[PDB]
Every structure is written in structure tokens, then in C-alpha cells.
Amino acid sequence: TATLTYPFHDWSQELSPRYAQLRASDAPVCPVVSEGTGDPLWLVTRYATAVKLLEDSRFSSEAAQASGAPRQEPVELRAPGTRGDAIAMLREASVLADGLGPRAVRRHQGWINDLAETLMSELASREGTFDLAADFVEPLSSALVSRTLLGELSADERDLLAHCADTGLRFCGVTHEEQVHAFTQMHEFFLEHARRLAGTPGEHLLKLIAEAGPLSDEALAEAGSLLVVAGFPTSSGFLCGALLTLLRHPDAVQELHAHPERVPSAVEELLRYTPLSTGSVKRMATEDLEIDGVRIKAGEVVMVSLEAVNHDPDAFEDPDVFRPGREGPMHFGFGRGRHFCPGNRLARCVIEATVRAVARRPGLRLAVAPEEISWHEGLFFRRPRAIPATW
Ligand code: HEM
Numbered sequence: 191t192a193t194l195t196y197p198f199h200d201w202s203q204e205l206s207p208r209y210a211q212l213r214a215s216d217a218p219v220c221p222v223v224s225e226g227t228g229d230p231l232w233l234v235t236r237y238a239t240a241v242k243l244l245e246d247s248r249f250s251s252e253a254a255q256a257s258g259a260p261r262q263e264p265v266e267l268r269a270p271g272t273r274g275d276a277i278a279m280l281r282e283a284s285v286l287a288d289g290l291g292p293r294a295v296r297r298h299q300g301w302i303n304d305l306a307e308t309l310m311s312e313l314a315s316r317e318g319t320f321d322l323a324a325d326f327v328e329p330l331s332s333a334l335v336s337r338t339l340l341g342e343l344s345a346d347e348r349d350l351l352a353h354c355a356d357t358g359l360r361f362c363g364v365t366h367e368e369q370v371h372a373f374t375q376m377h378e379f380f381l382e383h384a385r386r387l388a389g390t391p392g393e394h395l396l397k398l399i400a401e402a403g404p405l406s407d408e409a410l411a412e413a414g415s416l417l418v419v420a421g422f423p424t425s426s427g428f429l430c431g432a433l434l435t436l437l438r439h440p441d442a443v444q445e446l447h448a449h450p451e452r453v454p455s456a457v458e459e460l461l462r463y464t465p466l467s468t469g470s471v472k473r474m475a476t477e478d479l480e481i482d483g484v485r486i487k488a489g490e491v492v493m494v495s496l497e498a499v500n501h502d503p504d505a506f507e508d509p510d511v512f513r514p515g516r517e518g519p520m521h522f523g524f525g526r527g528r529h530f531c532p533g534n535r536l537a538r539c540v541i542e543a544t545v546r547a548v549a550r551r552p553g554l555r556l557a558v559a560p561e562e563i564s565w566h567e568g569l570f571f572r573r574p575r576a577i578p579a580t581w
Contacts (some may be wrong), residue, residue, distance in 0.1 A: 191223070193221060193222060193223045193230075193232075194208070194220070194221075194222045194223070194417035194520075195222065195223050195224070195225040196222040196223065196224055196225060196231060196233065196262055196469075196470075196493070197225065197262065197361055197468050197469050197470075198468075199323065199468075199469075199564045200468060201464055201468060201470050201566070201567050201568060201569070201572060202563070202565045202572070203431060203434060203435075203464070203560075203572070205465055205497055205498075205501065205512075207492055209495055209497065209498035209501070210498075210501070211234050212233065212235045212237075212498075213235040213236055213498060213502060217484065218236055218481070218482035218483065218484060218567065219232045219233070219234055219235065219239065219482065219484040219486070219492060220232065220233050220234075220235075220240040221233075222493075224260070224261060224262045225361070226262065226263060226264030226265075226361060226362075227260070227261055227262075227263075227264065228262060229260035229261055229262075229491075230490075231260055231261075231262060231420055231472075231492070231493055232452060232484075232486065232490065232491065232492040232493065233470065233492070233493045233494075233495065234492060234493065234494045234495070234499075235494075235495055235497075235498035235499065235502070236498075236499070236502055236504065237499045237502040237504060237519070238482075238504065238505075238520070239481065239482050239527070240494045240499045240522065241526060241548055242481055242482065242492060243473060243481055243492060244471075244473070244494060244525065244526040244527040244529075245353060245526065245527045246479075246481070248475060248476050248477055248479050249328075249473035249474065249475060249476070249492065250473060250474050250475075250476050251471075251472070251473055251474060251528075251529050252275065252277070252278060253473075253474035253542075254472040254474040254491050255267075255274065255275070255472075256275075256474075256475050257274070257381075259474060259491060260440035260490070260491045261472070261491070262361075262469050262470065263469070263570075264360075264361060264362075264366065265328070265358070265366060265367065265369045265370055265373070266373075267358065267359070267373065268377075269373050269374050269376075269378075269415075270349070270370065270373075270374070271487060272377060272408070272412070273412065274412070275412070276409075276412040276413050276416035277416070279409045279412055279413070279457065280399065280409075280413065281403055283403075283409065285395075285398055285399050285402060286395075286532045287532040288398070289393075289395045289398040289399075290338075290395065290532050290533050290535060290536050291535060292535055293411065293535060294338070294535070294536065295535045295538075295539045297393060298337065298338055298393070298536070298539065298541070299539050301337070302330075302333075302334070302539055302540055302543045303543045303546070305329070305330055305333055305543075306326075306330060306540075306543040306544055306547040307332060307547055308544070309325070309326050309329055309547070310326065310547040310548070310550075310551060312325070313325060313579075314551060314581070315388065318580065318581055319557045319578045319579065320578075320579055320580070321576045321577060321578060321579070322430075322433050322577035322579050323430050323574060323575070323576050323577045324576065325574075326429075326433070326508045326544075327426055327429045327430050327433070327563075327577075328426070330429065330540065330543075331425045331426045331429060331540075332348050332352075334421070334425060334536070334540055335348070335351075335418070335421055335422055335425070336348070336394075337392065337393070337394065338393065338394060338395060338421050338536060339391045339394055339395050339396065339417045339418075339421050340387055340394055340395075340396050340414065340417060340418075341387035341388065341392060341394045341396055341531070342387075342390055342392070343387075347379075347383075350375070350379065351376060351379070351418045351422065352422060352423075352426075353372070353374040354373070354376040354379075354418070355376075355418055355422045355423045356372075356423065356566070356569065357369060357371075357372035358370075358373045358376070358419075358478060359362060359419065359423055359569065359570040359571065360402075360568045360569055360570065361468065361469065361568045361569075361570065362567065362568035363567050363568035363569075365565075373415070374491070376414075376415050376418060377412075379410055379414075380410070380411035380413075380414035380415055381407060381408070381411045384396065384400070384407065384410040384411050384413070384414045385400070385407065385410065388400035388401065388410065389412075396413065396414060396417065398411070400414050420531075420533065421533055423569065423570070423571040423573070424466065424533075424537075424571050425537065425540065426571075426573060427466055427569070427571035427572050428461075428464065428466050428537070428541070428571075429540065429541065429544055430573050430577060431464040431465065431466060431572060431573075431574075431575055432460045432464050432541060432544060432545070433544065433548070433577055434464075434556070434560065434563070434577065435460055435463060435512055436460075436545065437554065437555060437556040437577075437579065438512075438556070438560055439512050440555070442456065442466050442512060442514050443548060443549055443552075443554075444552070445514065446466060446514070446545065446548075446549035447549045447550065447552055450546065450549065452514065452515070453542055453545050453546055453549065454542060455514055455515060455516075456514035456530040456545055457538055457541045457542050457545055458516075458521065459512060459513060459514045459515075459542070460512075460541060460545070461521050461523030461524070462499070462500045462506065462516075462518070462521035462522075462523060462536075463512045463554035464523075465497040465572060466496075466497070466523070466571055466572060467495075467496060467497065467531060467570060467572075468568075468569065468570060468571075468572055469495075470493030470494055470495045470496070471493065471494050471496060471525060471529075472491050472492070472493045472494075473491070473492055473494075474489065474490070474491050474492075475487065475488050475489065475490050475491075475492065494522075495535065496522040496523065496525065499522045500521050500522050500523065505518060505519050506518045506519075509579065524537070553581045554579060554580075554581060555579065555580055556577070556578070556579055557578035557579055557580045558578055563575075563576075563577070564576065
């Protein structure tokens with residue numbers, strides 16, 4: 191139909207040209223229809239409009255996540271018959287941001303940098319082609335989720351939760367039943383194992399959540415699923431994407447090799463330039479309102495594509511250039527406003543460790559052309575199947 195269907199199927203790092211086309215249109219908000227549900231939705235692609243929306247207290251994230259809300263995802267991102275409201279459950283009993291804040295980074299940054307170095311040093315001993323996805327990103331992200339979020343996981347437990355996240359957080363490529371089963375299996379996993387994981391010694395967020403009426407098993411289980419959904423496919427997808435960006439810009443890496451104090455600025459530029467989500471963050475209007483002149487009715491859902499906003503030329507001169515010394519406005523890689531990613535400091539810590547491990551070792555290169563990289567089709571959070579690299 192003559193209403194655009196969403197999303198735009200841009201599963202690789204090449205962003206769909208439709209985002210820029212909509213950005214340049216005469217509407218600051220454009221109506222679309224969900225490909226998976228047929229729901230009508232609105233879509234924002236301009237930085238200036240996105241700022242207004244994500245800072246507007248009349249636009250509710252929680253309302254957009256409730257059952258029956260119009261939505262872009264093919265299945266509800268919850269186990270059927272459960273609330274799927276982990277953040278509000280944690281309020282009814284701040285711990286999220288509390289245990290991921292600057293103190294937590296100061297605790298974990300040491301081993302995070304140790305591990306990035308250990309992994310890269312092992313790759314420095316390899317012959318021919320090695321896979322940065324399997325043998326760098328996977329072990330680093332697995333350690334992050336175990337040590338900081340869930341507690342020590344077995345290899346099979348890590349594999350189960352990563353598979354559940356890959357299967358449920360998809361626009362296509364799996365059946366409806368497989369997607370529900372992923373969320374069901376994750377929730378049933380935490381109903382049985384959250385108490386044990388929380389009770390093991392360590393710093394992990396799930397322990398902090400549990401050890402602070404009493405906290406029900408269902409609430410602790412919802413917290414587990416939230417940490418997997420929010421922390422696992424995002425960290426793995428972004429670290430993969432950031433490595434690809436670095437490998438495609440050797441002049442930038444040579445700059446960071448000579449001047450390591452420039453790494454933090456390059457981390458911020460990676461968060462702006464490297465696309466992650468193939469969908470959009472979403473908010474529901476809780477009352478009739480206007481945003482930039484467009485009238486939105488109560489109950490309607492407006493989406494913001496963070497990738498589109500991060501590539502807006504009204505905000506970033508030459509937005510499609512990876513410019514590590516860039517001094518633009520704040521990017522949207524972590525969102526904006528009330529729901530700004532509480533994992534942002536930990537994520538920045540692991541991205542910085544990755545950038546430093548690459549910059550210290552001149553000669554790392556992609557083994558094939560970027561267009562030969564294969565991508566998992568339909569993931570919410572883009573990720574290549576492998577990153578073949580050589581010295
Ligand atoms: C590179 C890694 C990551 C990226 C790019 C990222 C990105 C984001 C973004 C864009 C949002 C905003 C969603 C919205 O506005 O609706 C968000 C929210 C959130 N993030 Fe992250 N994230 C990452 C890693 C993590 C990690 C490691 C955690 C660990 C706890 C985490 C926990 C959360 C939570 C709980 C929320 C929801 C906050 C709320 O709705 O109030 N994220 N993240």
C-alpha cells in the first residue's frame with residue numbers, strides 16, 4: 191500500500207536510503223505501518239524533532255511497551271500472560287543506574303581492559319584468517335554479561351540466553367512460534383535460576399537487585415530477561431559493528447595508535463556513526479498533542495530511528511564521514527532523556543577497551559571486502575555472522 195511499511199530491511203551497515211528521504215520530506219513526523227502487525231505508526235528521523243519527542247513528558251515509553259499497543263515488532267517482547275514491565279516492577283519495590291554507574295566502571299574497567307588485551311594478544315599469535323566476532327567479541331561480551339549483569343554463567347547457559355535474544359529480537363527469519371518460545375524459555379529460565387544466580391558471590395546487577403515486602407520470583411525473573419534483552423545483543427552487535435568501522439578506516443586507527451588520548455573521542459564517534467538497531471525507539475502519546483506542528487492523538491505511537499538522527503546533516507556536518515575528532519552535538523546512540531541507556535558507562539568502558547586493543551596493534555585488517563561480510567538477517571540489533579581478519 192501507499193503507506194510505508196516498517197522496518198526498511200537494512201540488515202547490514204548500509205542504512206536504508208528511505209531514512210534520508212523521509213528526513214528531507216516536508217513532514218517532521220511521517221506515518222508508516224508495521225510490516226509485522228499492520229499497526230499504524232509515526233516515524234521521526236530529524237535530530238531536532240527527536241530531541242523534542244524524547245524529552246516530552248507526554249510521550250511514554252512504558253505505554254508503548256504495554257500489551258495491545260501498536261508496535262513495530264512482530265511479537266510482543268514478553269512471555270505471554272506476563273506484565274513485561276521490569277523497570278516499573280523495580281520501582282514499586284534506581285538500582286539499575288545505581289549498579290552501572292561510574293563507581294561500577296572503576297571496579298570493572300581493569301579486568302575489562304585485561305581481557306580485551308588477552309584476547310587480542312591471542313589473535314596476534316594466529317595464522318592467516320581469524321574471526322573477530324567469534325574469538326574477540328563473543329568472549330568479551332559473555333564476560334561482561336556474567337561479571338556485571340547476571341552472575342557466573344555456564345557456557346550452555348550463556349549460549350541459551352544469547353540464542354533466546356537472537357531469536358526473539360527479530361523482525362523476520364524465524365517463525366512466530368520460535369519467537370514466543372524464545373521469550374518463554376528465557377522467562378522460565380529465570381523463574382528457576384534467578385535466585386541461585388543472585389546468590390553467588392560477586393558484583394553483578396542481578397545480585398544487587400535481589401539483595402535490597404520481599405522481591406517476588408517473577409519480578410526477579412523479569413529483571414533477568416530485561417538485562418539479557420538490554421545488554422547482550424546490543425553489546426555484541428555494537429562491538430562487532432565498531433570493529434568493522436575501525437577496520438574500514440585505517441587512517442583513523444593509525445591516528446589512535448600514535449595518540450591514545452584521542453580514543454575516548456573516537457568511542458563517541460563510533461556510537462554516532464556505527465548503526466546498531468534496525469528498528470526505532472518508541473513512545474506513546476498519553477494525551478492529544480502536537481510535535482513540530484503534527485497532531486498526534488492519545489494512544490498513538492511515534493518511533494525515533496536513532497540511526498537516522500545520528501546521520502542527520504542538520505546536526506552533523508558530513509554525517510556519513512567517520513570523523514573521530516568530531517565536535518558535534520550529543521549523539522543518540524544511547525537515546526536521550528529519561529530513558530537514556532543506564533548501561534551507557536559500562537558500554538563506553540567496553541568499547542574503549544576494544545578500540546585501545548585494536549589501536550595498539552598496527553596491521554589488523556579485514557580479510558575480504560566489506561560487501562562480502564554476511565549479516566544475520568532481521569535482527570533488531572545488527573550483527574555480522576563473522577568478521578574475517580588478518581594481520
Ligand atoms: C553498546 C551497547 C549498548 C547500546 C548501544 C545501548 C543503547 C540503548 C538505548 C539507545 C536505549 C534507549 C531505549 C529507549 O529510548 O527506549 C537503552 C536503554 C536501556 N539500556 Fe542500553 N545499550 C547498550 C548496552 C546496555 C547494557 C550493557 C545494559 C546493562 C544493564 C543496558 C541497559 C539498558 C536499559 C535497562 C535500558 C532501558 C532504560 C529505560 O527504559 O528507562 N544497555 N540502551
